[PDB]
């Protein structure tokens, strides 16, 4: 018999939960989670040179634009997925119901 | 530049990221934290438009 007693302490560790990874897919709009950093975007090969210490990159604003892959240590840029407004060009419904 | 920067503020919330609020807290407390962020972001948009 083996008894596994789990001590509940205030210490910072709480470490054993396993983390299951997926494969890395680039150049597509995907959801992602990199070491707890989450978001939606398109991951592409980056030309940025992170120091061995650095893990994430940011813009002049705090929007994240790059990550270090935790297994390959490759730096990837995060491009927002395409988004924009839609305008409808209508001749008017008293003329035609064709729109652009 | 200011309006985007406002997305990083907490306005009294636990965190500026909606996904962290939803992942750490139960639904009704998360809703309170989200309303705190909604109020801050909406006020930021009203300021920008004015």
């Amino acid at each position: 018999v083996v008894v596994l007693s789990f001590e509940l302490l205030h210490a910072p560790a709480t470490v054993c939960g396993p983390k299951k990874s997926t494969n890395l897919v680039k150049n597509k709009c995907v959801n992602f989670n990199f070491n707890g950093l989450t978001g939606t975007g398109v991951l592409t090969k980056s030309n940025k040179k992170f120091l061995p210490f650095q893990q994430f990159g940011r813009d002049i604003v705090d929007t994240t634009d790059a990550v270090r892959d935790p297994q390959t240590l490759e730096i990837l840029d995060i491009t927002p997925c395409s988004f924009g407004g839609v305008s409808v060009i209508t001749p008017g419904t008293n003329t035609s119901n064709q729109v652009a | 530049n200011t309006l985007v920067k406002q997305l990083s503020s907490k306005f009294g919330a636990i965190s500026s990221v909606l996904n962290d609020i939803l992942s750490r807290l139960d639904p009704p407390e998360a809703e309170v934290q989200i309303d705190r962020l909604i109020t801050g972001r909406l006020q930021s948009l009203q300021t920008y438009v004015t």
Binding site: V61, T63, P80, F83, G84, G85 | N1, L3, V4, L7
Partner: peptide
């Protein structure tokens, strides 16, 4: 002779004042 038929003064004015949504692309366009 210019790619855009602007006057020398207009070309200066355009050079002196400074589809990829490079900036503030967080719902803002």
């Amino acid at each position: 002779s210019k790619p855009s038929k602007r006057s020398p003064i207009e070309d200066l004015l355009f050079n002196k004042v400074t589809l990829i949504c490079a900036q503030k692309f967080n719902g803002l366009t």
